[PDB]
Amino acid sequence: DDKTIVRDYFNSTGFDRWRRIYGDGQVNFVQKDIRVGHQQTVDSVVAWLVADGNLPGLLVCDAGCGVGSLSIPLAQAGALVYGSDISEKMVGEAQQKAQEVLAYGNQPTFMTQDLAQLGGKYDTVICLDVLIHYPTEEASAMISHLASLADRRLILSFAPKTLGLTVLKKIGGLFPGRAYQHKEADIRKILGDNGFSIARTGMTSTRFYYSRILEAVRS
Amino acid sequence: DKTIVRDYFNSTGFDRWRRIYGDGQVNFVQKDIRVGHQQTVDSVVAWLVADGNLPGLLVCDAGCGVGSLSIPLAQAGALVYGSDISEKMVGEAQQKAQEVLAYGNQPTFMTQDLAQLGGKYDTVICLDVLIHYPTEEASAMISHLASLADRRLILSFAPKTLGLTVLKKIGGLFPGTRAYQHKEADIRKILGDNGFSIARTGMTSTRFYYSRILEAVRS
Numbered sequence: 001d002d003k004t005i006v007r008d009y010f011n012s013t014g015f016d017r018w019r020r021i022y023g024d025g026q027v028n029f030v031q032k033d034i035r036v037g038h039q040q041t042v043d044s045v046v047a048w049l050v051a052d053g054n055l056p057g058l059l060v061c062d063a064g065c066g067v068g069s070l071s072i073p074l075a076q077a078g079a080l081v082y083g084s085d086i087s088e089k090m091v092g093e094a095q096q097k098a099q100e101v102l103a104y105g106n107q108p109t110f111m112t113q114d115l116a117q118l119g120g121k122y123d124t125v126i127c128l129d130v131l132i133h134y135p136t137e138e139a140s141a142m143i144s145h146l147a148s149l150a151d152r153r154l155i156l157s158f159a160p161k162t163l164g165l166t167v168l169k170k171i172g173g174l175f176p177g178r179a180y181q182h183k184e185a186d187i188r189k190i191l192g193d194n195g196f197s198i199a200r201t202g203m204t205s206t207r208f209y210y211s212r213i214l215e216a217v218r219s
Numbered sequence: 220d221k222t223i224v225r226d227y228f229n230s231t232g233f234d235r236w237r238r239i240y241g242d243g244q245v246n247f248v249q250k251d252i253r254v255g256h257q258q259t260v261d262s263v264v265a266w267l268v269a270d271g272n273l274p275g276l277l278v279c280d281a282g283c284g285v286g287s288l289s290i291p292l293a294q295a296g297a298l299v300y301g302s303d304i305s306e307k308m309v310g311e312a313q314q315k316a317q318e319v320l321a322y323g324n325q326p327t328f329m330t331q332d333l334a335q336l337g338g339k340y341d342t343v344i345c346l347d348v349l350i351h352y353p354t355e356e357a358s359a360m361i362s363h364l365a366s367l368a369d370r371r372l373i374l375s376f377a378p379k380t381l382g383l384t385v386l387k388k389i390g391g392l393f394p395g396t397r398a399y400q401h402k403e404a405d406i407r408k409i410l411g412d413n414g415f416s417i418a419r420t421g422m423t424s425t426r427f428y429y430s431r432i433l434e435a436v437r438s
């Protein structure tokens with residue numbers, strides 16, 4: 001049920017709002033802060049993979065790729081990127097953005113797909129800022145499936161805390177009549193049960209954006 | 220450092236690299252390097268062409284060699300000022316430009332150490348030059364080039380990459396290349412310190428040629 005709700009959102013009001021944030025057009029201070037925060041997360045992950053030295057020719061799965069904010073710079077650096085997203089609107093935008101940026105050079109292959117139904121095998125599987133849309137119990141099933149696609153590495157980002165959303169939930173009960181945080185201990189446990197140990201980690205914190213980043217490597 | 224590099228490109232380096240950057244017959248290694256370098260040049264020309272404002276664009280080509288980049292930029296209408304520390308390279312660039320461009324739009328070539336260049340340009344470009352200098356001096360060079368760029372600084376460099384790692388490992392297995400690789404994190408930091416952020420990037424990878432390309436724009 002959650003999948004349909006998230007999908008419909010990113011195919012409608014969510015598409016327009018987030019394509020503007022992930023884009024380069026004029027935005028208000030709230031959206032700008034979130035753009036900056038998200039850009040930091042993307043940049044951090046690209047930096048990790050570039051630093052390793054083996055990114056050119058590296059098989060990468062970008063699960064829940066959105067408008068290709070991560071797919072595109074990875075491809076620019078020589079990666080072989082397979083991007084997928086549950087939202088056809090997001091996928092279409094990613095394809096158009098990649099064609100505008102990369103023309104006919106090294107570029108991702110994009111596909112509309114629920115990550116839970118994703119197949120194939122990759123050196124590195126990446127899932128950024130997607131898990132926030134699902135409760136912990138559903139996140140475990142998602143992480144476990146992604147881990148099954150990862151020959152060596154799984155990178156995830158999640159919010160340990162969602163202030164604004166938490167505030168909204170608590171305020172909601174105060175009148176007649178969402179987002180999900182994940183505990184790092186819970187995420188690390190799920191990764192461990194799938195045979196992964198934690199390598200590098202990172203953290204992005206701005207005014208309205210908070211993302212914990214974990215690099216997990218197969219033992 | 221620069222004296223060694225200048226003397227090389229005024230003697231044996233001139234003879235060898237003029238041939239590589241030319242169209243004549245070469246060995247399999249130099250051929251691969253020719254192809255890789257051509258891809259780098261083509262990618263940069265493609266970037267500037269894509270912007271749609273190349274005609275009349277004031278461009279500095281620092282370390283221009285035989286004008287492999289300067290000439291096609293001038294062909295597309297750019298106002299190109301090319302310079303190189305080697306007068307032999309400059310002389311060859313001028314001869315090549317006169318041969319193919321006649322009296323039409325063409326670069327102005329000058330013999331000069333890029334660290335001593337003056338003027339102000341919309342876009343400053345330095346391709347495949349930083350490989351001849353250690354990170355310390357490379358940093359000083361980047362800072363100087365940035366001071367000449369009103370808007371944009373484009374750099375290419377050999378990064379830490381697996382292809383080059385393999386070659387160095389094999390080399391260490393026998394008793395016994397003056398080519399400096401640079402970490403992308405170091406380059407990005409230097410550019411950031413000079414008030415520049417990264418826009419487009421690219422990566423040329425052949426058998427023996429590896430060139431990371433960064434487009435940096437003034438914030």
Ligand SMILES: Nc1ncnc2c1ncn2[C@@H]1O[C@H](CSCC[C@H](N)C(=O)O)[C@@H](O)[C@H]1O
Nearest residue numbers: 010064065066069085086087114115128130
């Ligand atoms: N079950 C699922 N399978 C694949 N993608 C999903 C998904 N649930 C949500 N998504 C997608 O996850 C995206 C979150 S926005 C994050 C986009 C991208 N990872 C980035 O960081 O730039 C949305 O585009 C949404 O459509």
Ligand SMILES: Nc1ncnc2c1ncn2[C@@H]1O[C@H](CSCC[C@H](N)C(=O)O)[C@@H](O)[C@H]1O
Nearest residue numbers: 228282283284287303304305332333346348
């Ligand atoms: N300090 C310096 N200032 C200006 N040019 C330099 C320099 N040190 C080396 N060079 C020049 O940098 C060139 C590197 S070969 C690269 C040439 C050109 N950028 C191209 O990609 O086609 C050589 O011609 C060499 O003479």
